[PDB]
Amino acid sequence: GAIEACLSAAGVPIDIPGTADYERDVEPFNIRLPYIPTAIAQTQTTAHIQSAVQCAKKLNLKVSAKSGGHSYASFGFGGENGHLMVQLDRMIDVISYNDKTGIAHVEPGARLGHLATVLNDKYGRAISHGTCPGVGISGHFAHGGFGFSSHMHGLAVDSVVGVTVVLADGRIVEASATENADLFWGIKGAGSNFGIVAVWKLATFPAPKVLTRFGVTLNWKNKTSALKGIEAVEDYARWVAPREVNFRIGDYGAGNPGIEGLYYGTPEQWRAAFQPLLDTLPAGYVVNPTTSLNWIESVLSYSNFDHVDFITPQPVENFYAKSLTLKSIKGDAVKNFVDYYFDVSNKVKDRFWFYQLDVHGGKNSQVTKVTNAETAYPHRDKLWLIQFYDRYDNNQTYPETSFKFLDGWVNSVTKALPKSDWGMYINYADPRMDRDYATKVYYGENLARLQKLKAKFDPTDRFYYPQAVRPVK
Ligand SMILES: *Cc1cc2c(nc3c(=O)[nH]c(=O)nc-3n2C[C@H](O)[C@H](O)[C@H](O)COP(=O)(O)OP(=O)(O)OC[C@H]2O[C@@H](n3cnc4c(N)ncnc43)[C@H](O)[C@@H]2O)c(*)c1C
Ligand SMILES: O=C1N[C@H](CO)[C@@H](O[C@@H]2O[C@H](CO)[C@@H](O)[C@H](O)[C@H]2O)[C@H](O)[C@H]1O
Ligand SMILES: O=C1N[C@H](CO)[C@@H](O[C@@H]2O[C@H](CO)[C@@H](O)[C@H](O)[C@H]2O)[C@H](O)[C@H]1O
Ligand SMILES: *[C@@H]1O[C@H](CO)[C@@H](O)[C@H](O)[C@H]1NC(C)=O
Ligand SMILES: [Cl-]
Ligand SMILES: [Cl-]
Ligand SMILES: [Cl-]
Ligand SMILES: [Cl-]
Ligand SMILES: [Zn+2]
Ligand SMILES: [Zn+2]
Ligand SMILES: [Zn+2]
């Protein structure tokens, strides 16, 4: 048909329904949420991306880029059927590395494990990003990107010093502090809104040689212990936690919470640094043996796979997820959170679920050294980044009634807070919110500026998806 002909006329490779490449490319990470693009352009160059955007304009189509395909909402498809999908995941190279500056230029289809492998093995370098090796660089970096080096070195987005971008009108432009700084600001936290990033330009650091993985089995057997433990962790996070300590509270055992973390330094330095928290934890915790690691080893250690260099998708999952970013969990919020934890969550046994309470902000958190005004990322004044995840087996249907489980847990916290105290993180995209509400919680104090920038760069909503920022002149 018309779109296939258009793409082929411009030399853009297209997927053919029924072939291996098509089946691979069209499969969402979240199989709860498949969409059917009108066509898939499997791009190899910037020029391909550009030509694909031209065809979209010619045929009046919406266009969506898919990088690693990890959108919890399948937004890489456009979050609905019938978009032109620009499939980026064969564009995987570290294009160049400058050893005077430590800056790398990277293609937009490189996955985190692959990015980390190439930068380590070829250049001895590292970037602070997420833990999942199959996550795409573009979705991740465009909206933040949090992991076990973030307390020490900041968000994935904070490594970004420039981009090459294909705009809605087909132009290719550079953005950085010194050129299209307004576009640059939007790309850094809300990047899916403003074009298709074709090259990431990224500051790196020397790959650390000395790292310690640590863990604490909390043994919170009841509401009271959990309430006291979460209070104690917030205290340590807000006022004490050194830069070198990166951690979260996680429960993957419906009642077996643990601290997991990464410390920049030796096991003995970790213990001394963490002791103030261990001293205030409810009694009964058990400190796990530490593991000594270098950089590449730490990448493998938190990956949940037997390798990290992914150039293909990871196995798919079938799930629903939600998020919160909070100034503080103290007060009725934690009370309500723990009530639900014990009276509802721990009795949910028909599928796997977890929460993670990530130490995102706090006095010594590198994430907080950037303010909300400085990039699109709006969560700089939030101490907690919280993930809620609800997963069924791939041979089951996610039940229509199951949504109320995560909805109720999140409501347990939000009902206790003024709206100004909390947001939501679009890297944990939750499609069950209308366009206005979603963008309000995803972008906080930066939404109004983002709406203007949207009117400037994508006034026809060419890159539309249901939780894109609205263009408002
Ligand atoms: C599946 C998965 C997700 C994880 C995991 N671990 C995370 C972690 O340790 N920290 C985090 O901060 N986040 C974690 N996430 C969530 C991911 O961060 C998000 O799901 C990312 O958005 C995934 O990025 P990507 O794989 O590239 O997702 P896509 O679905 O392809 O696109 C997302 C979004 O971005 C737009 N987009 C893609 N490509 C571009 C370009 N080049 N330019 C502009 N916009 C782009 C898409 O259109 C879509 O809107 C661990 C696991 C296992
Ligand atoms: O769905 C598809 N889409 C991809 C993207 O076009 C096709 O790949 C191409 O197939 C071409 C034709 O054989 C090869 O020359 C080229 O190297 C290869 O990338 C693949 O054969 C086809 O099944
Ligand atoms: O953002 C994220 N997203 C993914 C979800 O897509 C999480 O993966 C989970 O991490 C858990 C903790 O290791 C595992 O037990 C679980 O099986 C695995 O799916 C990962 O820990 C988290 O950082
Ligand atoms: C919770 O567990 C702790 C551990 O012993 C205990 O002190 C406490 O009595 C238990 N329950 C309550 C309601 O405190
Ligand atoms: Cl094929
Ligand atoms: Cl809409
Ligand atoms: Cl709309
Ligand atoms: Cl308007
Ligand atoms: Zn590789
Ligand atoms: Zn306290
Ligand atoms: Zn393997």
**Opening angle at CA 129, ends 52 and 463, nearest 5:** 25
Distance (Å) from CA 26 to ligand 5 centroid: 12
The technique is X-ray
- Would the CB of 275 count as within 6 Å of ligand 3? no
166: which residues sit within 8 A by CB, 6+ positions away?
46, 49, 50, 53, 172, 195, 196, 197, 198
Instruction: Give bridge partners of residue 65 from the DSSP assignment.
Output: 86
Q: How many helices (H) and strands (E) does the chain have?
A: 14, 19
Distance (Å) from CA 436 to ligand 7 centroid: 9
What whole-number distance in Å separates Cα of residue 127 and Cα of residue 119? Answer: 8
Distance (Å) from CA 114 to ligand 9 centroid: 4
Residue 137 sits at φ, ψ, to 5 deg, of -50, -40
Cα radius of gyration rounded to whole Å, the chain: 22
Place of tokens 């809620």: 388
What are the angstrom distances between the C-alpha of 254 and each of 261, 315, 345, 363?
Answer: 20, 23, 7, 31
323: which residues sit within 8 A by CB, 6+ positions away?
385, 386, 387, 388, 424, 425, 428, 430
Question: Any idea of the CA torsion for 175, 139, 370, 130, to the nearest 10 degrees?
Answer: -140
- Would the CB of 13 count as within 6 Å of ligand 2? yes
Strands (E), 43-195: 63-66, 84-87, 94-98, 103-106, 125-126, 160-166, 172-176
What whole-number distance in Å separates Cα of residue 41 and Cα of residue 26? Answer: 11
Residue 429 sits at φ, ψ, to 5 deg, of -60, 130
Instruction: Give bridge partners of residue 21 from the DSSP assignment.
Output: none
Instruction: Give bridge partners of residue 203 from the DSSP assignment.
Output: 103
Do residues 203 and 97 lie in contact, with contact meaning Cβ atoms separated by under 8 Å? no
SS3 category, 443: helix
Q: Resolution in A, one decimal?
A: 2.1
Q: 13-36 burial, b for 16+ CB within 10 Å, e for fewer?
A: bbbeeeeeebeebbebbbebbebe
Cα–Cα nearest to 134, from 315, 262, 297, 392: 315
293: which residues sit within 8 A by CB, 6+ positions away?
211, 212, 213, 301
What whole-number distance in Å separates Cα of residue 347 and Cα of residue 324? Answer: 22
Six token digits for residue 96:
């160049």
- Would the CB of 387 count as within 6 Å of ligand 1? no
What is the side-by-side strand order in the sheet with 63-66? 39-42, 84-87, 63-66
What whole-number distance in Å separates Cα of residue 171 and Cα of residue 85? Answer: 18
- Please report, for the chain, the start and end positions of each structural domain, with discontinuous segments joined by +: 1-209+439-473, 210-438
What are the angstrom distances between the C-alpha of 395 and each of 25, 31, 348?
Answer: 20, 10, 19
- Among 4.10.320.10, 3.40.462.20, 3.40.50.2300, 3.90.400.10, what is the CATH number of 210-438? 3.40.462.20
CATH class (in words) of the domain with range 1-209+439-473 = alpha beta
Place of tokens 């990047």: 191
Six token digits for residue 437:
């509400």
